Paper text:
In the case of the opportunistic pathogen Pseudomonas aeruginosa, which causes lethal airway infections in cystic fibrosis and immunocompromised patients, the formation of biofilms plays an important role in antibiotic resistance and disease progression. Biofilm formation is mediated in part by the galactose-specific lectin LecA (PA-IL) and the fucose-specific lectin LecB (PA-IIL), as evidenced by studies with deletion mutants and the partial inhibitory effect of simple fucose and galactose derivatives in vitro and in vivo.[5a, 6] Understanding the glycoconjugate–lectin interaction is a key feature in developing potent biofilm inhibitors. Herein we report the first case of P. aeruginosa biofilm inhibition with a multivalent ligand targeting the galactose-specific lectin LecA, using the related β-phenylgalactosyl peptide dendrimer GalAG2. The structures of the lectin–ligand complexes were investigated to gain insight into the molecular basis of glycopeptide dendrimer–lectin interactions.
To probe the effect of the sugar-dendrimer linker on binding, carboxypropyl β-thiogalactoside (GalB) was also introduced as the last building block in solid-phase peptide synthesis to provide dendrimers GalA/BG1 and GalA/BG2, and the linear peptides GalA/BG0. In the structure of the GalBG0–LecA complex, solely the galactosyl group and the thioethyl part of its linker are well-resolved. Interestingly, the linker moiety points perpendicularly away from the protein surface in GalBG0, thus indicating impaired surface contacts of its tripeptide moiety with LecA. Considering that the number of sugars and the peptidic scaffold are the same in both series, the presence of the phenyl group in GalA dendrimers led to a remarkable enhancement in affinity compared with the thiogalactoside GalB dendrimers. The presence of the aromatic β-phenyl aglycone in the GalA series caused an additional affinity increase, as indicated by the ratios KdGalBG0/KdGalAG0=12, KdGalBG1/KdGalAG1=4, KdGalBG2/KdGalAG2=4 (MIC values: MICGalBG0/MICGalAG0=32, MICGalBG1/MICGalAG1=21, MICGalBG2/MICGalAG2=160).
Author numbering:
A (entry chain A), B (entry chain B): 1 to 121
């Protein structure tokens, strides 16, 4: 299991100790407050009122928590995943990333606290 | 395990099928959008900018997801709990509740989708 902070301004993302392997079932819970620029802050689902202006994940709002597994594209995490299994052929290290537009992470702030565990399978 | 919706206007709370027993470890993941009255909506952590005007749970923001276990007082849930154990002497059915001021639930809208499972222990 892994617990750590994911900084909103960390464009490369936060690498975890979790290596997702075929057949694995995992659970993620994410909490906290972060911003993609404004003085306001949002939770791990991001800002539902803000337009997508080139986000690294088009399937979640700006400011949402997303992830990559090995060399996958971005996958929405939001507040978390419950006893979740990955798509076929998706495997490898889990990296957590704040959803923002490439090159615009410098004015971000805050972070999410995240737990990941592997479940019975 | 249990999956269901918790309506923001449900003042009595949503009873789940989970009976928390001594020693149990549980995980909860909550997602979605709801409001305590304004046109805007907030996620399961509620509205960090809104003052507490008599919330059923003073340890969470207005519009946050909270719970009671048996005859316990309210306990924050927010986006979820990861492999969590209850305080001593807390046991019974888990009821999930939107955090608002008593008697002011009538103008609430939206809901959270919540999963609860018991973990290995
Ligand atoms: C202008 C609105 S705020 C704007 O939103 C962008 C993403 O869409 C970037 O994250 C920014 O850095 C932020 O200033
Ligand atoms: C006051 C601004 S909105 C106000 O906030 C409340 C709780 O603090 C109640 O939920 C009311 O229903 C709501 O209209
Ligand atoms: Ca930004
Ligand atoms: Ca209300």
């Amino acid at each position: 299991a892994w617990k750590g902070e994911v900084l909103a301004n960390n464009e490369a993302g936060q690498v975890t100790s979790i290596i997702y392997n075929p057949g694995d079932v995992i659970t993620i819970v994410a909490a906290g407050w972060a911003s993609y620029g404004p003085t306001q802050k949002w939770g791990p689902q991001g800002d539902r009122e803000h337009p997508d202006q080139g986000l690294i994940c088009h399937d979640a709002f700006c400011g949402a928590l997303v992830m990559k597994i090995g060399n996958s594209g971005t996958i929405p995490v939001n507040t978390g995943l419950f006893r979740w299994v990955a798509p076929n052929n998706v495997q490898g290290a889990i990296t957590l990333i704040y959803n923002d537009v490439p090159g615009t992470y410098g004015n971000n702030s805050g972070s999410f606290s995240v737990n990941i565990g592997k479940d019975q399978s």
